Amino acid sequence: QDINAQLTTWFSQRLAGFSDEVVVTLRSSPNLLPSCEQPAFSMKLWGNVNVVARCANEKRYLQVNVQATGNYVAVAAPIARGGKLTPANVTLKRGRLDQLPPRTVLDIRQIQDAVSLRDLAPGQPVQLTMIRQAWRVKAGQRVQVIANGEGFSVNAEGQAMNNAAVAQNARVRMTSGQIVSGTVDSDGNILINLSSSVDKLAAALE
Ligand SMILES: [Cl-]
């Protein structure tokens, strides 16, 4: 029961913070098990995984099944496409992590300012493919364009032409109809960082 106890302890410690119940089952032939007392294990965190087990003169490829139970983010109330994920409509549920659909959110902090891309039903695990970050800037919104660099500062008002989250690109129509583009910041401003532009900016003032 040596290898089974060692693998159980190894995956339990590796899964600290993800799971409080880790069960390991060997799927490969016991004839290909490491011979040494303390094999070095190395490596997907759970489910059907391959583990390399090294001993002096051995490099075993073990196939194991890892059952890991812990918390994951699930839908707690109906959420419409475009609906904000809140503490009223998404919660932590306890379940078999190894049976979850791909890219299920495990940490409730990952869903802060998230918005649903789909109509979601209660009990559904929240997957990264079902959600997006909220729009800090929305199409048609009055925004501030801030350009800085080479002893120059420009502050101008415009209308956001597209929806954009923080750190995403936003095109902005200036009052004349000229379109500029920059990065959305936490304040909903559009940031531009400035070779001929600093020369062009000064030339515009002439
Ligand atoms: Cl949004």
Q: Is the domain covering 134-206 a CATH 2.30.30.760 domain?
A: yes
Question: In angstroms, what is the span from residue 82 Cα to ligand 1's centroid?
Answer: 6
CB count within 10 Å of CB 66 equals 24
**Residue spans in the chain of domains classed CATH 2.30.30.760:** 134-206
User: What residues have CB less than 8 Å from 71, skipping those under 6 apart?
Assistant: 92, 93, 94, 106
Q: This structure's resolution (angstroms)?
A: 2.0
> Which phi-psi region, left, alpha or beta, contains residue 123 (left: φ > 0; alpha: ψ -120 to 50)?
left
155 CB-contact burial (10 Å; exposed 0-12 / middle 13-18 / buried 19+)? exposed
The experimental method, as deposited, was X-ray
Rounded to whole angstroms, the Cα distance separating 162 from 1 reads: 61
Among 162, 158, 140, 156, which residue's Cα sits nearest to residue 204?
156
User: What residues have CB less than 8 Å from 108, skipping those under 6 apart?
Assistant: 73, 90, 92
Is residue 157 within 8 A of residue 166, CB to CB? The reply is no
**Dihedral sign computed on CA atoms, order 9, 60, 54, 56:** positive
Q: Which two tokens stand for residue 13?
A: 């410690």
The angle at the Cα of 180, spanning 178 to 186, to the nearest 5 degrees, equals 140
Question: In angstroms, what is the span from residue 138 Cα to ligand 1's centroid?
Answer: 8
Is residue 71 within 8 A of residue 107, CB to CB? The reply is no
3-state helix, strand, coil in the chain (%, to 5): 15, 45, 40
Question: In angstroms, what is the span from residue 165 Cα to ligand 1's centroid?
Answer: 8
Rounded to whole angstroms, the Cα distance separating 64 from 49 reads: 6
